[PDB]
Amino acid sequence: VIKNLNTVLDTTVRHQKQFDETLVNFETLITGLKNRADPIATSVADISD
Amino acid sequence: NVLSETVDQTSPHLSAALDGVARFSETIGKRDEDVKKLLASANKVATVLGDR
């Protein structure tokens, strides 16, 4: 457990800046999509139909 | 007298406790550098998680 967890954690630390930025970017994207979810879902259904 | 009777009562249950504590303590004692590096990396990752 110690060995594998240390391996994964140092792997994440090597990309610490990107791992920190991606949470913010993903939250921004998901919020922007949720604020228009109903038009987006309606548009997807209309495209399929 | 209190110390004498306490040692007389807790003696039979001490060897197993000492053995188990020694084994479990050595489990982390023989991996000190690994544990410390794990704690540092976990500090970085948990700080990133908590800040976001």
TrEMBL record, chain A:
Official protein name in the record: Virulence factor Mce family protein
Organism, as annotated: Mycolicibacterium smegmatis (strain ATCC 700084 / mc(2)155)
Residues of the full protein shown: 197 to 245 of 343
UniProtKB/TrEMBL annotation, chain B:
Name of this protein: MCE-family protein MCE1c
Organism: Mycolicibacterium smegmatis (strain ATCC 700084 / mc(2)155) (Mycobacterium smegmatis)
Organism ancestry: Bacteria, Bacillati, Actinomycetota, Actinomycetes, Mycobacteriales
Span within the parent record: 159 to 210 of 524
